Amino acid sequence: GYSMFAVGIGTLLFGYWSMMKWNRERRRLQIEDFEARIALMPLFQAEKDRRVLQMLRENLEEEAIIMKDVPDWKVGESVFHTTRWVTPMMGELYGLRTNEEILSATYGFIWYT
Amino acid sequence: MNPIIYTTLIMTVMSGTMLVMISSHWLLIWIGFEMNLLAMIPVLMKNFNPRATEAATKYFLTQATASMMLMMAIIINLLYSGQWTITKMFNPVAMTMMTMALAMKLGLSPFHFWVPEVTQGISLQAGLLLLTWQKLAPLSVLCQISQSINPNLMLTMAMLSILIGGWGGLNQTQLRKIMAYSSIAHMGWMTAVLPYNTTMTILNLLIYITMTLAMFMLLIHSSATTTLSLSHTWNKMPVITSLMMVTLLSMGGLPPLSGFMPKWMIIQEMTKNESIIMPTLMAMTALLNLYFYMRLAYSSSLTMFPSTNNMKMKWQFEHTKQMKLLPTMIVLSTLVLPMTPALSSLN
Amino acid sequence: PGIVELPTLEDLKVQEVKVSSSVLKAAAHHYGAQCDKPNKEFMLCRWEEKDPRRCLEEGKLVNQCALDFFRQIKRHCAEPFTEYWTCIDYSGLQLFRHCRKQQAKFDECVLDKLGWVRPDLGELSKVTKVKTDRPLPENPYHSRARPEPNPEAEGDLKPAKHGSRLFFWTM
Amino acid sequence: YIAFILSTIFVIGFVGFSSKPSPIYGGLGLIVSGGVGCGIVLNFGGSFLGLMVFLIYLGGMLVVFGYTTAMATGDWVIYDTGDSGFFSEEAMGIAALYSYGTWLVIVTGWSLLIGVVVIMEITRGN
Amino acid sequence: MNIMLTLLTNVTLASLLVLIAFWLPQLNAYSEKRLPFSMKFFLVAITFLLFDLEIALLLPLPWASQTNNLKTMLTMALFLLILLAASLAYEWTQKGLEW
Amino acid sequence: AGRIASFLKNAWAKEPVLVASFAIGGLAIILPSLSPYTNYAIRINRATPYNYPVPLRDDGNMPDVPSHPQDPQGPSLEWLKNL
Amino acid sequence: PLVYMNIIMAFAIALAGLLMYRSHLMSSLLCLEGMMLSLFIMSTLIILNTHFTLANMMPIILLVFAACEAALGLSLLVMVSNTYGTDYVQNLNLLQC
Amino acid sequence: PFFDVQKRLGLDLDRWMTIQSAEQPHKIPGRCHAFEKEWIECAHGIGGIRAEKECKIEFDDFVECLLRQKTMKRLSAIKRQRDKLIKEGKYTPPPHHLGKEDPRP
Amino acid sequence: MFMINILSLIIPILLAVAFLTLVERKVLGYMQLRKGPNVVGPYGLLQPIADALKLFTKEPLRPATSSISMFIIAPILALSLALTMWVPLPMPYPLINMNLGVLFMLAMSSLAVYSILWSGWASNSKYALIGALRAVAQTISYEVTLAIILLSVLLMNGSYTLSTLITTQEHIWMIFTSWPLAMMWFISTLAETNRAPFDLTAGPFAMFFMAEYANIIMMNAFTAILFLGASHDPHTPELYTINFVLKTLALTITFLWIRASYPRFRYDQLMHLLWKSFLPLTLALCMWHISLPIMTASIPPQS
Numbered sequence A: 001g002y003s004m005f006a007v008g009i010g011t012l013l014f015g016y017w018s019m020m021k022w023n024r025e026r027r028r029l030q031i032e033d034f035e036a037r038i039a040l041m042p043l044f045q046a047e048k049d050r051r052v053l054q055m056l057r058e059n060l061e062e063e064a065i066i067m068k069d070v071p072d073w074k075v076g077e078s079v080f081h082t083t084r085w086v087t088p089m090m091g092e093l094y095g096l097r098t099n100e101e102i103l104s105a106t107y108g109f110i111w112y113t
Numbered sequence B: 001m002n003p004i005i006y007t008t009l010i011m012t013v014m015s016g017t018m019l020v021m022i023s024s025h026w027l028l029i030w031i032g033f034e035m036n037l038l039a040m041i042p043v044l045m046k047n048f049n050p051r052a053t054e055a056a057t058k059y060f061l062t063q064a065t066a067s068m069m070l071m072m073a074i075i076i077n078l079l080y081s082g083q084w085t086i087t088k089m090f091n092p093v094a095m096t097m098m099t100m101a102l103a104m105k106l107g108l109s110p111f112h113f114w115v116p117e118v119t120q121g122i123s124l125q126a127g128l129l130l131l132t133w134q135k136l137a138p139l140s141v142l143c144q145i146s147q148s149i150n151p152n153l154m155l156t157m158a159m160l161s162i163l164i165g166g167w168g169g170l171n172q173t174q175l176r177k178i179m180a181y182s183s184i185a186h187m188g189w190m191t192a193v194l195p196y197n198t199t200m201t202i203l204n205l206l207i208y209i210t211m212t213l214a215m216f217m218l219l220i221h222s223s224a225t226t227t228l229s230l231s232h233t234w235n236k237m238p239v240i241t242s243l244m245m246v247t248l249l250s251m252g253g254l255p256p257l258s259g260f261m262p263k264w265m266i267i268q269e270m271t272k273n274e275s276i277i278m279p280t281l282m283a284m285t286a287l288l289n290l291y292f293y294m295r296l297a298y299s300s301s302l303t304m305f306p307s308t309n310n311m312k313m314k315w316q317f318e319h320t321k322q323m324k325l326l327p328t329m330i331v332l333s334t335l336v337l338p339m340t341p342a343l344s345s346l347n
Numbered sequence C: 001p002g003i004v005e006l007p008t009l010e011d012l013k014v015q016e017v018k019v020s021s022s023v024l025k026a027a028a029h030h031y032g033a034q035c036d037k038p039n040k041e042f043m044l045c046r047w048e049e050k051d052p053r054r055c056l057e058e059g060k061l062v063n064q065c066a067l068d069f070f071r072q073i074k075r076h077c078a079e080p081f082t083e084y085w086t087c088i089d090y091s092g093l094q095l096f097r098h099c100r101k102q103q104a105k106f107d108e109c110v111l112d113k114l115g116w117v118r119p120d121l122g123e124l125s126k127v128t129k130v131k132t133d134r135p136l137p138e139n140p141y142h143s144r145a146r147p148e149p150n151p152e153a154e155g156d157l158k159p160a161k162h163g164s165r166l167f168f169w170t171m
Numbered sequence D: 001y002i003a004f005i006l007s008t009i010f011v012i013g014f015v016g017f018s019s020k021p022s023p024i025y026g027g028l029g030l031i032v033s034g035g036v037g038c039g040i041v042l043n044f045g046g047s048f049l050g051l052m053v054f055l056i057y058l059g060g061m062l063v064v065f066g067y068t069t070a071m072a073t074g075d076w077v078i079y080d081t082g083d084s085g086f087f088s089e090e091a092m093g094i095a096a097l098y099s100y101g102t103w104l105v106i107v108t109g110w111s112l113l114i115g116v117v118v119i120m121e122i123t124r125g126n
Numbered sequence E: 001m002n003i004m005l006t007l008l009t010n011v012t013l014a015s016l017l018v019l020i021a022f023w024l025p026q027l028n029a030y031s032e033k034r035l036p037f038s039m040k041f042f043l044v045a046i047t048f049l050l051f052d053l054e055i056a057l058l059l060p061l062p063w064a065s066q067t068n069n070l071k072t073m074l075t076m077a078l079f080l081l082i083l084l085a086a087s088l089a090y091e092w093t094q095k096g097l098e099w
Numbered sequence F: 001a002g003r004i005a006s007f008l009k010n011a012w013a014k015e016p017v018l019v020a021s022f023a024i025g026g027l028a029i030i031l032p033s034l035s036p037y038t039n040y041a042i043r044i045n046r047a048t049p050y051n052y053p054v055p056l057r058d059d060g061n062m063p064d065v066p067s068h069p070q071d072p073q074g075p076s077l078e079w080l081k082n083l
Numbered sequence G: 001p002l003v004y005m006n007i008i009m010a011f012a013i014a015l016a017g018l019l020m021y022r023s024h025l026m027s028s029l030l031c032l033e034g035m036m037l038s039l040f041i042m043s044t045l046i047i048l049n050t051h052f053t054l055a056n057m058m059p060i061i062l063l064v065f066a067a068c069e070a071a072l073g074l075s076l077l078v079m080v081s082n083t084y085g086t087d088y089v090q091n092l093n094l095l096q097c
Numbered sequence H: 001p002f003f004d005v006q007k008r009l010g011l012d013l014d015r016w017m018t019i020q021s022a023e024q025p026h027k028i029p030g031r032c033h034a035f036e037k038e039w040i041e042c043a044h045g046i047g048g049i050r051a052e053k054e055c056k057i058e059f060d061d062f063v064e065c066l067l068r069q070k071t072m073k074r075l076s077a078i079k080r081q082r083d084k085l086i087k088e089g090k091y092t093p094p095p096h097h098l099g100k101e102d103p104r105p
Numbered sequence I: 001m002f003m004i005n006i007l008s009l010i011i012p013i014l015l016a017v018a019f020l021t022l023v024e025r026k027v028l029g030y031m032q033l034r035k036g037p038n039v040v041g042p043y044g045l046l047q048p049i050a051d052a053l054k055l056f057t058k059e060p061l062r063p064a065t066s067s068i069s070m071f072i073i074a075p076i077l078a079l080s081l082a083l084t085m086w087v088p089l090p091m092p093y094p095l096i097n098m099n100l101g102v103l104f105m106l107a108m109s110s111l112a113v114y115s116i117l118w119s120g121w122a123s124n125s126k127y128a129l130i131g132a133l134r135a136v137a138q139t140i141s142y143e144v145t146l147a148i149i150l151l152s153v154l155l156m157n158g159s160y161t162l163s164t165l166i167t168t169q170e171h172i173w174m175i176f177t178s179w180p181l182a183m184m185w186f187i188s189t190l191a192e193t194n195r196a197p198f199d200l201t202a203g204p205f206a207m208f209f210m211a212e213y214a215n216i217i218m219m220n221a222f223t224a225i226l227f228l229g230a231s232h233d234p235h236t237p238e239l240y241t242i243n244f245v246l247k248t249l250a251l252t253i254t255f256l257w258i259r260a261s262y263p264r265f266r267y268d269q270l271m272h273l274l275w276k277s278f279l280p281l282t283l284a285l286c287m288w289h290i291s292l293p294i295m296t297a298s299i300p301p302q303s
């Protein structure tokens, strides 16, 4: 009676202690991984900005070519009253590209398993 | 039910209403309406019989549909503007949906059909609660968004409510249906003034609540639910019938009683906005409510109907439970016209 | 209304860092320790200007700094680095904890070659300060002028003239 | 236009069960519609909320509905551009319920307890 | 799209196997010759529904434990569980769990 | 004190499941407010960097803010390692 | 766009079906539940598209409350059946205007 | 009607969830954080009538960010013109828009 | 080669539930002082083939008055769900790596009652309808406590990802951290599959039986992953697969042992068991497992 409860409490406490140590170690490992990501982040930001700007410029050149004969069109006009930079939507960067890469940029992360 | 459970349910109803009244987030207002509806159903069904169950299911279906459309209006408003605060409605379709949902919650015409049946099905205490307390939350929400209401729709529903209440009250011999149609007409009067002045709406609501509380408590004291049952009260307690006659005269808008104060004020306010035809029609139509109030007064206290022999035994007994605030309700519903300028307290 | 200004494709040309994610992860700690200054200048500029087009020069600078770092690694510590990033590249999670042994070798090698000390725990997540000559933007949000507030009347309260003045009431 | 195809099916199932034929078959139609809607939410990116539909809605509420019945007789453009970091924003916003939404938790728990009490009182009968 | 293909394959195989099972023995020639409505079962279903709603509320706990507001989160989680236990106790005491 | 002891002894017989349930629930309610490691858990949650640390513009008036990650200024995680 | 329109159209169809009332009050409850499911989908899509993080609780909340209401309605239905032997809508004619 | 208990007591019962730009967990921004912040700062302390009349620019930009109707209209016009030109046979896509390009990190 | 992976997941499961019938008969026979099938085949190894062929060659007794629609729909849903529950399981790598794998299993398990309800409704009998209603009530009752126990256990894991359970149990099993939750989880899995002591209730029948046995094996595999975590070496996953399969087999044989050992409950008795012994203990242990990681500063990493 008493011995069974003592054994159960003992194994519970041993498991609690082991899991405490392991979870603290896992927290430290996660911090190390997050620090590596933080160190790598600025280069990724620079590359992302360059890529977005290149896509926007290419779309601008193609729009200038296509909409030449349209009477009332203005090439590269904004839809906002403000002159502040606005982050582009997905349809703005891949609007004129093929369906495979459109579907990639839209659903690749969601459909990846 | 158990008195503890009944008290808890009543407190939950009041807490849902207060949550609607104190919150600035649309989701919390919806939650308050949901809590109120959830706690309201057992109160209607407290005395179990098929009529009470039928009334409870009718009320549930109506209120659930209204709450669903209220959620839809909130979602459309959020879609066209990332806002959750209860303010200007930002969209005409969403505002029309919200107005219709709140109209069905209040029972305004053409969504008036459930009120007489629900009131007839439930007892007199449940009817008192349903016709007094269950109007605060939708009217408060309407007051908060008054600047965005389309006046045409609001005025159409208000005038329809006045007409429907006046016409439907003429045909009734059941007292609870008479109260329901009177409530519909008074709701029309209350909502006809929302586009112009919400203080007038609140004043009308307070006067109507006082009068309805007085009349329902008088009906509970003389436990009558039909015209003929009320015609026997003079042979046991004529004072109750005389007080009820004066209260009915007040409810008809006759000066110098209290019930004249709202209409008068509302008419004045409407005239200040170059609205002349509508207040005229409104008073003409309130004449119908006055007519069936007068018919009740004729059958109740101004004439003496035949009695029964077994009434003699009832002469030997007194009411065991006395309702407090009944004398105060009668006085407040009859004799507060000289204190009219107190409305500047933004009641 | 208005025309969106975009830099030419020539403004977006720079020698790209052409290594994969495992190689970057293997050297992430030393890269953060050594290339901190250009990266922090670029990130401060990015968070202050709120415009990608205003931060291109700092991006080219951080690319150049990364290239210099990787050239030093190539010229000094090629093979231990190769083993370390092959380690990292095998795993599906790219975990640091599987083959610390290789990591040690890499660390030892750099400590013998460039005197590089790996930053400790909690050090790369510190908020540091940047000394820059770039002027602080005054209206990064491009806001217009705020409308003037209401007059905000104030004074001493006096009793209402002749009272409520409601119909026949004299008070 | 995968999202559009799902939407069309969603409306078709709604028309199917809204005709109200043989409430068991209306329940089957509503089950199909709920599955398609959960698929829409999953394809959008709301994994937890779609799975919440699929678990709570389908497996509890429609199951109870069917039990009670048995007793008786254009896209892809409006999307984002960046990434969410090293977590999912939907999970963070949902988990903020215990740190930000104390008021919501209080009112919801009170409502659920009141609902249990109300159901018992109503089904008592007498 | 991988999950879509997996579900399609599972459903296709199930349909094919069940169809062949139901149609293979149909080629040979052979002879080819209420009211009660128990309340208790409805009550069990409704109790399941309400408890499932409370489980839906409790589900985000694995993520709720990283907030830096550990005291508030712990208080609210214990509040939810205590009200769930109170619901069970109320159903138990008013003879709602009998057969 | 006798009545409570008698009630506990009578409940431990013929109702051990409920006694265990109430004991475990009460312990779970009470212990966290008395443990000293809950503050450590809060600190561990604080020290997990999910976002990028945005640097501050130096004006010569921030001696507590380090200029490099290896600088001794700023928060430390030696306590976490020693745990 | 089109996706939002379909969701709204589904809500309108469910509301119309609820207001048709052929028979079988259970069909009315099913229409209410379909309306709520449409609302859930629509609100979830709006909240996810605009990255309103703190609003992610809102769908869950709605769902919970709606299901509670559903339970309530079911109870009412059962009681009505226990009085008449069926859930027929035309049997609820004791109270009239 | 509205009884501002929160403002009287400084409670913040539900104000934390009313706008996109109000202290999201882990500092995760809304998609239209800047437009909403500008509109709120324009309209603050002025009243609904004056805010509706005078802060219309900010609200229009916020609605454009939220629903992107103008952007989708412009993209649709460009795509329709491109489709008409390619059907006629005068414009051809470059290799960048045909998948023949050189990707960058 | 994703189709090859899907087929290599599906077919061996079907073969395993085919031979689990022979293993069950043999084990029950030997615990009953007799032998199982040992004539058809060298040691009964051909018995499942014989039963399958006989079942597929026997006449199907359609009611001739029932709704064919739900009658054919129910086995399809049952077998499809039984096969779908296997795809997120890591051994050591899942076919489909899901963030919320555990929630996915819970959702499909909640779906599983529809086959019972539809088969009972389409049977065109009042007594079969009563039996189906009783089974549905028992199943939902026990899945409540399944869900609560599952969330309590995952509170030490950090997420709903099934692969993380391998990382969580790298040094010690979860059985040592929480054995009472494991006991209640085992009993609830027994009551979920209508297995003795909870078994209170030709082609389509074969499909239903196959779905039931696949569910049994799947539940035991999930229990083995959840509570007895095997060590996984990234450069030799065969070791993890062997350990996981051995633990799953041990748990299945324990199911057979329990079937061979005990009488069966009454309906009210198992309902009382759940609602008055498992639910209070589960709620108390859920409070304990919420409080414990905060008390001991042992919160798992991921968020």
Ligand SMILES: CCCCCCCCCCCCCCCCC[C@@H](O)O[C@H](CO[C@H](O)CCCCCCCCCCCCCCC)COP(=O)(O)OCC[N+](C)(C)C
Binding pocket: B202, B203, B206, B207, B210, B332, B333, B336, B339, B340, B341, B342, B343, B345, B346, B347, H001, H002, H003, H004
């Ligand atoms: C029949 C006449 C009506 C009777 C009404 C019942 C009488 C008993 C009620 C007892 C007094 C209740 C007052 C509560 C005490 C403090 C109230 C205070 O905290 O609230 C203030 C509010 O005080 C109340 O509004 C004043 C109530 C006084 C009612 C008297 C007016 C009656 C009309 C004239 C008829 C004469 C009646 C005289 C005999 C009683 C601040 O309001 P605020 O949160 O900032 O704005 C919300 C309201 N808005 C939206 C309309 C602007």
Ligand SMILES: CCCCCCCCCCCCCCCCC[C@@H](O)O[C@H](CO[C@H](O)CCCCCCCCCCCCCCC)COP(=O)(O)OCC[N+](C)(C)C
Binding pocket: D099, D100, D102, D103, D106, D110, E069, E071, E072, E075, E079, H013, H023
């Ligand atoms: C003031 C009047 C008191 C008496 C009247 C009470 C009226 C009815 C009861 C309802 C009132 C609810 C009170 C709690 C309001 C919630 C807000 C407050 O508690 O602050 C929270 C603090 O949390 C508290 O710990 C909540 C404890 C309250 C719950 C325990 C008992 C609740 C019972 C309430 C009645 C429900 C039914 C009764 C059941 C017995 C927020 O914590 P904090 O982290 O700073 O801010 C979050 C934002 N961050 C993330 C940016 C930092």
Ligand SMILES: CCCCCCCC/C=C\CCCCCCCC(=O)O[C@H](COC(=O)CCCCCCC/C=C/CCCCCCCC)COP(=O)(O)OCCN
Binding pocket: E082, E085, E086, E088, E089, E092, E093, F011, F015, F018, F019, F020, F021, F022, F023, F024, F025, F026, F029, I276, I279, I280, I281, I283, I284
């Ligand atoms: C303060 C902490 C609260 C939070 C923890 C709660 C966790 C979950 C527990 C609550 C679940 C619901 C409980 C419902 C209670 C119902 C009680 C009841 O009515 O049962 C009685 C029987 O039980 C009773 O007698 C009433 C309760 C008895 C006392 C139970 C424990 C009380 C406190 C004991 C522990 C105190 C602290 C322990 C400290 C020990 C040292 C560490 C009737 O049972 P029948 O099914 O009708 O069968 C009887 C015929 N054979």
Ligand SMILES: CCCCCCCC/C=C\CCCCCCCC(=O)O[C@H](COC(=O)CCCCCCC/C=C/CCCCCCCC)COP(=O)(O)OCCN
Binding pocket: A012, F017, F020, F024, I180, I182, I183, I184, I186, I187, I197, I223, I227, I258, I262, I273, I277, I278, I281, I288
């Ligand atoms: C300071 C730290 C505190 C730590 C807190 C934890 C402390 C733990 C205290 C003890 C907890 C143990 C609880 C374990 C489960 C208890 C459930 C229970 O006891 O229910 C029984 C009943 O449970 C059963 O008997 C179900 C068994 C059904 C037969 C099925 C076969 C089971 C036997 C085979 C062994 C199973 C092994 C499982 C291993 C799982 C591996 C994954 C009660 O029923 P009654 O006797 O009728 O009494 C109540 C009525 N008045």
